[PDB]
């Protein structure tokens, strides 16, 4: 049951990370390195609570 659990937990971690970043191609759930490049807030949803600069 120890071996079965770590197999399911490894799938769970990849599936959990896939919810915020879905799977587009063969790379799988959360398999895109470009997602973690520098990103900015959209123009229609700026920072509502504080200053940006």
């Amino acid at each position: 049951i120890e071996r079965m659990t770590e197999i399911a937990l490894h799938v769970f971690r990849k599936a959990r990370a896939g919810k915020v970043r879905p799977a587009q191609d063969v790379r799988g759930p959360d398999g895109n390195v470009n997602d973690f490049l520098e990103q900015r807030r959209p123009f229609e949803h700026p920072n509502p609570t504080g200053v940006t600069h």
Binding site: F43, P46, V51, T52
Partner: protein, 62 residues
């Protein structure tokens, strides 16, 4: 123009002038200071509308 300032007086007698412009019946029930409350109070009402400006940049609204 000096004769135009006296235009509403030439059509009236002295008794009518006194009753019209001098002997105004006393009525101390009016909120005379509403003129100032509306004017100066408009700054606060204008701020309620102006604090919602869709200018995205924070320093632009500054």
């Amino acid at each position: 123009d000096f004769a135009e300032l006296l235009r509403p007086l030439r059509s009236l007698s002295f008794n009518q002038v006194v009753d019209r412009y001098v002997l105004i019946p006393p009525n101390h029930t009016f909120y005379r200071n509403w003129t100032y409350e509306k004017f100066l109070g408009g700054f606060g009402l204008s701020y309620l509308i102006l604090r919602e400006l869709p200018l995205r940049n924070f320093y632009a609204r500054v």
